[PDB]
């Protein structure tokens, strides 16, 4: 499952974690098994304006 | 006190049962000893812990 | 006030709507300890210290 968030929001992507994104965008199960990968894409996603 | 043996058996049984009932109201390290209170105050993860 | 003189306020004898506070969306952290962030709109307290 791929998506984009803010860096400060990477914490919210975790089982049993409460937050706006984790609750209304992408909620993981409490017994989730897997692995979360997050990598910065500022140079490829940020443009002036 | 002529029936001391029978009275003692009754007392032991009653005291064990009362000790169990009293032990039903101990925290054991939880926030509270009331299961309804835990359920109404906490969300699934820490509720189950 | 400053942290070493943190201001304290007393809340009682009123109806607290925590849904609006939780949905303000302007709070960086809303860390609730001992009680859940949700399910706080149906609980009753003798006191609230702010």
Swiss-Prot record, chain B:
It comes from the Viruses. It comes from Severe acute respiratory syndrome coronavirus 2 (2019-nCoV). Changing residue 12 to H: In strain: Omicron/BA.1, Omicron/BA.2, Omicron/BA.2.12.1, Omicron/BA.2.75, Omicron/BA.4, Omicron/BA.5, Omicron/BQ.1.1, Omicron/XBB.1.5, Omicron/EG.5.1. This is Spike protein S2'. Residues 7-49 form a coiled coil. Subunit of the fusion protein that is processed upon entry into the host cell. Mediates fusion of the virion and cellular membranes by functioning as a class I viral fusion protein. Contains a viral fusion peptide that is unmasked after S2 cleavage. This cleavage can occur at the cell membrane by host TMPRSS2 or during endocytosis by host CSTL. In either case, this triggers an extensive and irreversible conformational change that leads to fusion of the viral envelope with the cellular cytoplasmic membrane, releasing viral genomic RNA into the host cell cytoplasm. The gene is S.
């Amino acid at each position: 499952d791929s998506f984009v968030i803010r860096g400060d929001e990477v914490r919210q992507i975790a089982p049993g974690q409460t937050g706006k994104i984790a609750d209304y965008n992408y909620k993981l199960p409490d017994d989730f098994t897997g692995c979360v990968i997050a990598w910065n894409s500022n140079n490829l996603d940020s443009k002036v304006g | 006190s002529a029936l001391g043996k029978l009275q003692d058996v009754v007392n032991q049984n009653a005291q064990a049962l009362n000790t169990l009932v009293k032990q039903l109201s101990s925290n054991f390290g939880a926030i509270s000893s009331v299961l309804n209170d835990i359920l109404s105050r906490l969300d699934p993860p820490e509720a189950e812990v | 006030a400053s942290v070493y003189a943190w201001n304290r306020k007393r809340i009682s004898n009123c109806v607290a709507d925590y849904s609006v506070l939780y949905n303000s969306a302007s709070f960086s952290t809303f860390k609730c300890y001992g009680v859940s962030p949700t399910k706080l709109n149906d609980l009753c307290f003798t006191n609230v210290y702010a």
